Design an enzyme around this catalytic site. Structure first.
Site, PDB file in Angstrom:
ATOM      1  N   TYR A   1      19.295  11.751 -29.994  1.00  0.00           N
ATOM      2  CA  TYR A   1      18.460  10.763 -29.335  1.00  0.00           C
ATOM      3  C   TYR A   1      19.123   9.375 -28.690  1.00  0.00           C
ATOM      4  O   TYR A   1      20.256   9.337 -28.864  1.00  0.00           O
ATOM      5  CB  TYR A   1      17.396  10.022 -30.361  1.00  0.00           C
ATOM      6  CG  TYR A   1      16.385  10.754 -30.803  1.00  0.00           C
ATOM      7  CD1 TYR A   1      16.144  12.289 -30.785  1.00  0.00           C
ATOM      8  CD2 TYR A   1      15.199  10.382 -31.420  1.00  0.00           C
ATOM      9  CE1 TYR A   1      15.390  12.829 -31.103  1.00  0.00           C
ATOM     10  CE2 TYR A   1      13.922  11.291 -32.072  1.00  0.00           C
ATOM     11  CZ  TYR A   1      14.139  12.678 -31.822  1.00  0.00           C
ATOM     12  OH  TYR A   1      13.069  13.464 -32.163  1.00  0.00           O
TER      13      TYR A   1
ATOM     14  N   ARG B   1       9.286  11.606 -23.415  1.00  0.00           N
ATOM     15  CA  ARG B   1       9.753  12.862 -23.656  1.00  0.00           C
ATOM     16  C   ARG B   1       8.671  13.850 -23.521  1.00  0.00           C
ATOM     17  O   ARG B   1       7.536  13.682 -24.145  1.00  0.00           O
ATOM     18  CB  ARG B   1      10.587  13.029 -25.273  1.00  0.00           C
ATOM     19  CG  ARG B   1      10.540  14.485 -25.469  1.00  0.00           C
ATOM     20  CD  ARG B   1      11.335  14.373 -27.004  1.00  0.00           C
ATOM     21  NE  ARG B   1      10.983  15.706 -27.816  1.00  0.00           N
ATOM     22  CZ  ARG B   1      11.787  15.860 -28.866  1.00  0.00           C
ATOM     23  NH1 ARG B   1      12.097  14.981 -29.552  1.00  0.00           N
ATOM     24  NH2 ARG B   1      11.844  17.176 -29.337  1.00  0.00           N
TER      25      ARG B   1
ATOM     26  N   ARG C   1      21.995  19.427 -27.722  1.00  0.00           N
ATOM     27  CA  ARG C   1      22.293  18.092 -28.033  1.00  0.00           C
ATOM     28  C   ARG C   1      23.647  17.631 -28.228  1.00  0.00           C
ATOM     29  O   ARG C   1      24.182  17.124 -29.130  1.00  0.00           O
ATOM     30  CB  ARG C   1      21.073  17.584 -29.137  1.00  0.00           C
ATOM     31  CG  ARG C   1      19.852  17.805 -28.814  1.00  0.00           C
ATOM     32  CD  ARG C   1      19.025  17.439 -30.197  1.00  0.00           C
ATOM     33  NE  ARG C   1      17.670  17.289 -29.577  1.00  0.00           N
ATOM     34  CZ  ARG C   1      16.714  17.043 -30.419  1.00  0.00           C
ATOM     35  NH1 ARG C   1      16.849  16.625 -31.849  1.00  0.00           N
ATOM     36  NH2 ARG C   1      15.452  17.025 -30.205  1.00  0.00           N
TER      37      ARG C   1
ATOM     38  N   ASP D   1      11.961  15.933 -41.524  1.00  0.00           N
ATOM     39  CA  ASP D   1      11.833  14.719 -40.745  1.00  0.00           C
ATOM     40  C   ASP D   1      10.648  13.732 -41.367  1.00  0.00           C
ATOM     41  O   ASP D   1      11.026  12.474 -41.274  1.00  0.00           O
ATOM     42  CB  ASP D   1      11.078  15.125 -39.381  1.00  0.00           C
ATOM     43  CG  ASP D   1      11.981  15.823 -38.392  1.00  0.00           C
ATOM     44  OD1 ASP D   1      13.066  15.418 -38.237  1.00  0.00           O
ATOM     45  OD2 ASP D   1      11.562  16.724 -37.700  1.00  0.00           O
TER      46      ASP D   1
ATOM     47  N   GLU E   1       7.801   9.561 -27.884  1.00  0.00           N
ATOM     48  CA  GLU E   1       9.208   9.152 -28.022  1.00  0.00           C
ATOM     49  C   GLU E   1       9.505   8.225 -26.757  1.00  0.00           C
ATOM     50  O   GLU E   1      10.758   8.159 -26.414  1.00  0.00           O
ATOM     51  CB  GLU E   1      10.116  10.204 -28.392  1.00  0.00           C
ATOM     52  CG  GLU E   1       9.759  10.714 -29.889  1.00  0.00           C
ATOM     53  CD  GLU E   1      11.001  11.618 -30.241  1.00  0.00           C
ATOM     54  OE1 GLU E   1      11.771  12.276 -29.332  1.00  0.00           O
ATOM     55  OE2 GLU E   1      10.838  11.975 -31.381  1.00  0.00           O
TER      56      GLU E   1
END
Ligand SMILES: *[C@@H]1O[C@H](CO[C@@H]2O[C@@H](C)[C@@H](O)[C@@H](O)[C@@H]2O)[C@@H](O[C@@H]2O[C@H](CO)[C@@H](O)[C@H](O)[C@H]2NC(C)=O)[C@H](O)[C@H]1NC(C)=O
Ligand SMILES: *[C@@H]1O[C@H](CO[C@@H]2O[C@@H](C)[C@@H](O)[C@@H](O)[C@@H]2O)[C@@H](O[C@@H]2O[C@H](CO)[C@@H](O)[C@H](O)[C@H]2NC(C)=O)[C@H](O)[C@H]1NC(C)=O
Ligand SMILES: *[C@@H]1O[C@H](CO[C@@H]2O[C@@H](C)[C@@H](O)[C@@H](O)[C@@H]2O)[C@@H](O[C@@H]2O[C@H](CO)[C@@H](O)[C@H](O)[C@H]2NC(C)=O)[C@H](O)[C@H]1NC(C)=O
Ligand SMILES: *[C@@H]1O[C@H](CO[C@@H]2O[C@@H](C)[C@@H](O)[C@@H](O)[C@@H]2O)[C@@H](O[C@@H]2O[C@H](CO)[C@@H](O)[C@H](O)[C@H]2NC(C)=O)[C@H](O)[C@H]1NC(C)=O
Ligand SMILES: *[C@@H]1O[C@H](CO[C@@H]2O[C@@H](C)[C@@H](O)[C@@H](O)[C@@H]2O)[C@@H](O[C@@H]2O[C@H](CO)[C@@H](O)[C@H](O)[C@H]2NC(C)=O)[C@H](O)[C@H]1NC(C)=O
Ligand SMILES: *[C@@H]1O[C@H](CO[C@@H]2O[C@@H](C)[C@@H](O)[C@@H](O)[C@@H]2O)[C@@H](O[C@@H]2O[C@H](CO)[C@@H](O)[C@H](O)[C@H]2NC(C)=O)[C@H](O)[C@H]1NC(C)=O
Ligand SMILES: *[C@@H]1O[C@H](CO[C@@H]2O[C@@H](C)[C@@H](O)[C@@H](O)[C@@H]2O)[C@@H](O[C@@H]2O[C@H](CO)[C@@H](O)[C@H](O)[C@H]2NC(C)=O)[C@H](O)[C@H]1NC(C)=O
Ligand SMILES: *[C@@H]1O[C@H](CO[C@@H]2O[C@@H](C)[C@@H](O)[C@@H](O)[C@@H]2O)[C@@H](O[C@@H]2O[C@H](CO)[C@@H](O)[C@H](O)[C@H]2NC(C)=O)[C@H](O)[C@H]1NC(C)=O
Ligand SMILES: [Ca+2]
Ligand SMILES: [Ca+2]
Ligand SMILES: [Ca+2]
Ligand SMILES: [Ca+2]
Lengths: 388, 388, 388, 388
Positions: A324, A212, A289, A70, A198
């Protein structure tokens, strides 16, 4: 000469419609495309733009191996034409960043860019291309921001910033910034919200942020903010939750606290209050996801025994990867039109995406006061065709 | 209509913050990127830009073999969006050049471009895209200039130009140029300065230049210049020297002469006077072009027994390659913000960079009156992944 | 609002200086660059641009095999930033063309584009991007034009056009075109000029064109033209000839007729009248298209026993390939600055360029009233490194 | 400030002349070019642009395999400079679309973009970059539009939209849209027209559309439309038909009904009424999509015993592949100039194009009141050189 953006109400809408799609992974098969994640969209007076955190490598090259990571010094916020794939010939580098937010105030772009060591990061504030201010990590644990557009009203931009651990204590703040200068900040009250990261924000007279909770809430926390202060906070009342993971529908109505089930890790998402109702984006899967749908929940913004899913649009099938998602607004005549993007993540760690890299494409939708049709707009890449 | 840039003071600052990073070598793995060296940054009214001396070849192609060579007819000054990698689809060619300087006067760009034979070079002056004047080599030994931005005040641009041998005698001049026409030049006084090359300049009411002594000084020579004449000269007083190579800290305080130790070959670098103090960029290594740090030396601009390194930011680790560095300024409200770039050289002759080419990426930092965090922003390429 | 370009005199100059160089063949090693020939340069109010006839193929691809061929339907006039290599990401297509000319009138671009069958071609006139007029082949034998910039005075553009055989009879015309509409044409008088092709023109109050006689003259024909008519014609008096092939220096002084020796095939070239003197570009070789030099011949514009080469600048060595060359002008304060480009042809049919394609790079020079240095600025490609 | 485009007459013309050609397949040999089909051209105040439906893949990559398929979620309307090949470095993505139309109203671009499932598609209306309105499929059978430019008069844009089966019943509508808002629609009368798809439109005071009957007519249906309503309808009277397939010349004169022979499948094409005469584009072949010619038929717009082909220009030979063709207009002084493009399809299903992909290049022509020459401007790719 252009005026600062004003506090307009949200336009009426009854459905969402396909806007721009970049097909970036498909188009990256021959190694032209820059590796990215955490994309978003934001618009100026004339154009909408794609933004994303690049990884300083081209997709399918050896440097793209391991880009699931990340935070690196080789990540930059980049901008490219909306719906295009990001390539060396079309991108602009906004700032060095492994977390970012951007918004246009009516006159100039502001960006918030975090980079540096996890325990000593700083956020650089860029305004009209100049570095004008900064925020120093005060909790020394991954100073970080929205990963989608901030919002500006009458010249004052509002942005949510977090410093501290995941799935535990942490500081959550809102910053007010005007022409690139920090005016003030507030610690978000913890009377209701227990965790916030976020944030996806939009303007409906005031700024609304739906965020979130990565610790205890499968329901999403939210704030209402104006050019001076935080007005209200809560969790989205809807008994149909919209984080991932989450309990199966129907779940608990918790307006004032986390659901206390399926709390983490969560995913960045968004929603839109509409009167007493609420629209919520979510993955189709309750666990992972995959897929993307948006639901309208009647009276979902409020405490009510009458929550019902009046509309469900399935926009990315559960057989397809998502990621996302975030809100953005586009000025119409005398209102702001609600829109959103969905990040379509391919590569690691997705099951059966047997490549060494991690990247994404983008699809976007906008709200209109008309009835929608139906379709499916997934990433569309055959992972077996891709350089690994 | 735009006015000429004015003589503003330097903004206050207490630390430097990461701005733009191009990751050009990483992004060049698939042969898209133009081979460069001697990069710099300069800004107009609207945007900052990357500049560099290209080598007329793409990185990793056969024509890139041997690009350690400094002067060829195939070198051009090129411009590309700040923080982007230079590729055929995004660059502009400014002029043929193996040495250059550029600056924006508020209305138009001026460039100074040297090319031709070592013993018969000429500098072309470009203003608003037109070739307006020239300088003929008068010592017939590598006529050359700053390799970073020049400075313009009230329409008159000031640029340092050298002709003559390295590590020995040589002529050093300042030229004043207005709307592309040479107005006058002065030979830099040799009362203090003994050698001057590759000046890094900025504006703090007057123009200040901190340069490279490649013969006898491990301390950096400097000049203060206005729109008409050279006001003062010296060497930076700081007993902590900032060229490479240099003696270990602490060394000698020499305000008025070269240190007479570790004089060559030196490296292009920069600094900023702040009251009686001075900020100096330098390689982390005292011997080679590795790492990059910036130090603040209390009372380092003046003759004082009290020099102390009050701040040290390490921005590129000593395990990572650096290179040239230079100053640039960005207009703020009523002051100029100090910024700098660092050239990150990869390839020959760097130990263990086993490729046949020589090129660089860029990282940049700007000063703010806030406390910085910490991090490391090196080139980041795995040389073993690169086409040789 | 911009006025039409006016009839300014040529600026004073005493030498030529290196301006822009694209290194297009070197940069084309990885197949990014568009195959071209017959390049030229022309400028608008803000920028100078490269133009060339593309071949509808990328260099080093299979479609580039055989591009020595001059006329195909796949040739287009393209424009790209001056000194850049032409690539798909930076070019604009102006019109379909295997012969062209372009000029900017102060308000808009005009282009003249010939295409179609050799025996039935037409020229399309483009003005401000719109096709506004046309010329039909009247001799049905390769209707063709300058392959460099035309000139516009007070809104009327002047361009030379030829239809008919090489090395024999043929019609030569000048066309006057205003805002894209053909106003009139004149057949060039044959009292002196016997053959005229590929005129290189500039403005010195009136339009002067120095052209190519491909039949009987090793000396170059010329015309002086205003916004209404042809004023004068002749051959350049200079006893030092400037076509290729040509007799060795010194040769014959022929002001009013072809030299009648070494007449063909010739090459496109240029010159500049300066008082009674003349500057002439030429290949270094008297037989082939290698090298490039420019000479000043004292009293070379007139009938005189005193012709002497007062200056010779060698800009491309005789060991390096050249090609077409042409004039262009850049507006200065109250005069036009004389500039020129040189086409550097690589590939077929050049001896030892063992590739199947034919293309070129570009180098350019401008005149200043200063003394030049010296250097060499050839194409610079190692043909053995290139895809064949 | 720019006014809305006005209702100007068509300019006089007597022939068509080669304008722009992209050579996109030739230039795509090294996998740089985006796969497309259904291209068209439309112009704003300053420039003409290429548009096409991309397939979300680069030509010759594995994702390009199977792109004969007409409708996928990975298709987007893209825009790129006229006469250039579409590449990642030069394109803009307009909207997600597998059917589209675009037109400029004098102030802003409008686009109509259909996407989604065949049985539940929606058309998104984009105006000035914002999604402003939509049309929902009402017959649930491939809601679809022109695949060429729409037309706008005095701020109201007119566009033809179809929903329903091919070669059978179906609804055909015209929509009027002003500043992106749908004002009204009309069902096209079926008194004469029996089938209408893929209208090619232009302005000659009113909007004229010449379309495709894919069921019973080898002659083309047409409509005349103003800013409020449909004025007239018919089939083109010309006894020389212009769809593909079609009967051999001479065929039947049917002004008011389909020919009832060789009705399907047809191909998108165009024409221009000129007084009582008509110009019609058509494939050279009467059976397949090869070649392209334009004919003028004397009195071909009306019921007359005197139809004669007074002019025939063959622009693409019958040995070369063609495809869709469509009209566009360019504003001249006080009239609109008629122009057209021809899609040159390569790949599947063309006989002997042994590659797995389907794509196209573009060539364009404009009308002038001058006599044309002759030539041939086909795609020009050697399919055997192409990545499969
Ligand atoms: C914040 O903005 C207000 C104007 O916006 C109104 O009040 C906000 C708090 C919010 O409720 C918006 O939706 C409202 O539209 C600014 O108020 C103005 O202040 C100036 C200077 O005092 C005064 O002249 C005007 O009358 C005020 N305008 C209005 C409409 O009341 C206020 O100054 C802003 N505050 C900051 C810190 O920038
Ligand atoms: C993705 O990278 C891994 C790891 O690469 C190794 O470690 C990196 C940090 C870098 O130092 C590389 O040069 C190293 O090779 C690759 O896995 C390695 O594969 C090599 C070659 O087969 C093998 O020698 C090593 O043992 C492997 N290392 C590990 C930890 O598995 C992997 O193959 C790369 N994936 C792709 C698709 O190329
Ligand atoms: C050089 O600039 C000055 C103005 O700048 C001031 O003086 C400089 C030398 C330097 O100290 C700056 O920091 C100062 O701000 C010009 O002086 C102007 O000259 C004009 C014409 O004579 C006169 O009308 C003004 O009064 C002067 N302005 C000021 C503020 O004094 C001077 O002309 C410049 N010289 C050249 C050669 O361009
Ligand atoms: C980088 O180039 C060197 C030198 O290349 C040679 O000299 C150049 C000027 C040019 O003329 C080339 O064509 C020549 O080959 C390469 O070293 C050479 O390698 C070749 C092939 O193995 C060998 O025949 C020569 O003996 C070598 N010459 C020397 C002086 O070492 C070198 O391999 C190139 N590096 C890379 C990574 O390709
Ligand atoms: C051609 O241009 C002239 C102006 O240019 C002058 O005359 C040219 C022939 C040439 O010698 C230039 O170098 C000169 O500068 C135009 O003359 C003008 O005409 C208008 C209308 O009749 C008149 O009002 C002006 O007085 C004239 N201007 C001058 C300076 O004499 C002439 O109209 C142009 N002809 C065409 C066909 O466009
Ligand atoms: C450049 O092209 C020539 C010619 O190619 C042939 O003719 C072309 C028009 C086209 O039809 C091609 O497909 C043909 O191959 C090449 O010369 C040919 O090479 C092939 C393969 O070795 C051989 O079979 C033929 O006999 C050759 N034809 C001739 C007339 O020589 C040539 O090799 C190409 N050059 C390069 C560097 O690839
Ligand atoms: C449609 O446009 C007309 C103007 O265009 C004229 O009429 C069209 C129907 C068509 O025939 C064109 O070719 C003609 O040029 C608009 O008429 C105007 O309306 C305004 C407001 O009522 C009035 O002030 C003007 O006088 C009218 N102008 C003219 C020239 O008659 C009409 O409003 C348009 N309708 C719509 C629905 O937008
Ligand atoms: C174009 O694609 C076909 C089909 O590819 C197969 O089906 C696709 C949907 C996708 O799933 C691919 O991965 C599949 O391979 C190719 O034809 C196949 O070729 C492979 C390899 O030779 C063979 O194993 C299969 O049997 C073939 N399938 C069929 C139905 O023919 C074809 O080769 C591709 N064309 C090119 C030029 O690459
Ligand atoms: Ca959660
Ligand atoms: Ca030194
Ligand atoms: Ca000759
Ligand atoms: Ca038909």
């Amino acid at each position: 000469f252009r005026p600062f953006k004003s506090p307009l109400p949200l336009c009426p809408f009854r459905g969402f419609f396909p806007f721009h799609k970049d097909n970036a992974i498909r188009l990256g098969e021959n190694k032209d495309v820059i590796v990215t994640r955490e994309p978003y969209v934001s618009c100026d007076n004339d154009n909408c733009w794609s933004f994303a955190l690049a990884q300083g490598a081209l997709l399918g090259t050896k440097h793209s191996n391991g880009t699931i990571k990340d935070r690196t010094p080789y990540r930059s916020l980049i901008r490219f034409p909306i719906g295009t794939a990001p390539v060396l010939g079309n991108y602009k580098e906004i700032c060095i960043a492994w977390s970012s937010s951007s918004c246009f105030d009516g006159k100039e772009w502001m960006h918030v860019c975090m980079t540096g060591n996890d325990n000593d990061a700083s956020a650089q504030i860029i305004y009209g291309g100049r570095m004008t201010d900064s925020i120093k990590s005060w909790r020394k644990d991954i100073l970080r921001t929205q990963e989608s557009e901030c919002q500006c009203i009458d010249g004052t931009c509002v942005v949510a910033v977090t410093d501290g651990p995941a799935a535990n204590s942490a500081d959550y703040r809102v910053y007010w910034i005007r022409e690139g200068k920090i005016i003030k900040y507030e610690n978000v009250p913890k009377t209701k919200i227990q965790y916030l990261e976020e944030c996806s924000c939009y303007v409906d007279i005031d700024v609304y942020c739906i965020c979130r909770d990565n610790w205890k809430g499968s329901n999403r926390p939210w704030m209402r903010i104006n050019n001076e202060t935080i007005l209200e906070t809560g969790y989205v009342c809807s008994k149909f939750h919209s984080d991932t993971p989450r309990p199966a529908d129907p779940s608990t109505m918790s307006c004032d606290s986390p659901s206390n089930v399926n709390g983490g890790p969560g995913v960045k998402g968004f929603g839109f209050k509409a009167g007493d109702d609420v629209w919520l984006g979510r993955t189709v899967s309750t666990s992972g996801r995959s897929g993307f749908e948006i639901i309208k929940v009647t009276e979902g913004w409020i405490n009510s025994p009458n929550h019902v899913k009046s509309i469900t649009q399935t926009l990315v099938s559960n057989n397809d990867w998502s990621g996302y998602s975030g809100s953005f607004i586009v000025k119409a005549k005398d209102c702001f039109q609600p829109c959103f993007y969905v990040e379509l993540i391919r590569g690691r760690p997705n099951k059966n995406d047997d490549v060494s890299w991690t990247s994404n494409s983008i699809v976007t939708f906008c709200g209109l006061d008309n009835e929608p049709g139906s379709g499916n707009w997934p990433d569309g890449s055959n992972i077996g065709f891709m350089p690994k």
